[PDB]
Amino acid sequence: SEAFLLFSRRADIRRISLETNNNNVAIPLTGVKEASALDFDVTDNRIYWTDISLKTISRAFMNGSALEHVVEFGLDYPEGMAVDWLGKNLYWADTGTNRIEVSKLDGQHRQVLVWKDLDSPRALALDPAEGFMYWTEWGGKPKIDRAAMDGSERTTLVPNVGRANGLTIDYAKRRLYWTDLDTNLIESSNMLGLNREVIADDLPHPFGLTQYQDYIYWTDWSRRSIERANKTSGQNRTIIQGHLDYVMDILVFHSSRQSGWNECASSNGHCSHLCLAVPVGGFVCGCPAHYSLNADNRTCSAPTTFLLFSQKSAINRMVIDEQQSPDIILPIHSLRNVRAIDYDPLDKQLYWIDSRQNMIRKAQEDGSQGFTVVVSEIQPYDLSIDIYSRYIYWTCEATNVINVTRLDGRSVGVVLKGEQDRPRAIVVNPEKGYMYFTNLQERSPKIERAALDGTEREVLFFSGLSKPIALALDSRLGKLFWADSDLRRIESSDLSGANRIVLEDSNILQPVGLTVFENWLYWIDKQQQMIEKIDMTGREGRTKVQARIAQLSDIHAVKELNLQEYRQHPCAQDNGGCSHICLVKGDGTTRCSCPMHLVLLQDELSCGEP
């Protein structure tokens, strides 16, 4: 339980003993590029640090063992971070994403706590024994803010201040400390931001700050030092170490800095996912981002109705609620060029085409159970899942076919081949037994319909098209939707091809995807880097959903599957007995068909070779 001073500099985290004169050592870390923000857990002597250049948060024991990345995705500049040693939680702030997030100390159950009207949150301090967290905001109007450790009742504590750093709590004396990088002061106040006092005014460049016993410790970037002085008088100064340029953070490794108790410490509040300290009532139960807290206030429920949108190297999820929950990146590894996404509502699994690997991959939203459904002259261009028959209908840019594969990877076969066919975008309609696709023949783009076995093929549209690259449909309204990236517009029509109408053609730069959510049609504008939606009832206006999203690739809405309605489909029960293709006719009855390389047997159910 010796007192240690830890500081971050360059790619190292180094250690200074505060009790023995003879002690300077580097923590044996591997693979760190820029060690910024430091904290620790008194429970297990683990140290935590963020990396501005790696855009990660990591942890390890002080002897360098059990190096672990706990946060990897969705970080831009994680300059603030703090361990909740009572609730066993990890808080951090990102000045790039303008977010303050929480997760378990192993990174599980990541949730966003502050995301609105937040400009450059940088320095974070936690008081779990009281239920408050404090942070500094940079930006146009810098301030020191306060909130509960669940993000609620956010308030501005100290409005007149420059860019403050090294926000530190003196738990014994109930005082806040910080450096001001604009006034070049070290200041102190009470927990309410009152009784403000300048502790040191003669420092040329104070940056980092911490407190131990009757001393405060700071770093000066002009003096290249870690220095220490009386926390009350500012005197009794001593230089802990010099010739240390650009120390990012200092931290006191001692149990006195992590003491006290709250309800989360004794029982985790019995919460399933997150126990968050709050001032009044002690604690509330939290949930991972987009999850719902149940009626018991103890257990969480994952969203069943959400919006997925993908970039070149990311697949994101957002919900449509009224607290305007933020969009999150799904922690999915090895994404290189995502060009199309889909979702299976039955097994709750995410599907996408990566055209760098020329594969159809599938995973869960946590990135687990990664599976390759289609692999190597294979060039998947678009995909659409038949959720009842458990097939993927996907287009192949190399062989110019429409191929069908089951979700587990077993090949059904090709249902469309053609000399001059260029099948690119595709949406299935298993409810009516048809599929819709674009034919990007040079000098004659087309939107076509066919049955899910290739028969009954007809051209619905062959004019007023330049590059129809995205398709959507809705079986209840009987409507088909598409976006033309060259004509820069979105159209719709009946599934029969009647009532073709232009939905939107103004202020669209390059629409490359679209999807339908109830009465709302969403699309992504790659060049304009935004998501937009229009109310198809005409009631509400065209709304900008999110902007500044680069490399947009696809967008896909997911509605909670109604299992009673699902099992009412005849092809959901043993494919209707069909070996390969189960089809729905106008009679609502089931018929079986085959891929192009098989023929239907006299069993009226099974496919065989010619």
Binding site: Y77, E79, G96, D119, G140, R163, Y246, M248
Partner: peptide, 14 residues
């Protein structure tokens, strides 16, 4: 090489 720079929105390499 990079030197840390205090900006309006945080510390950045510049």
């Amino acid at each position: 090489g990079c030197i840390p720079v205090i900006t309006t929105r945080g510390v950045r390499c510049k």
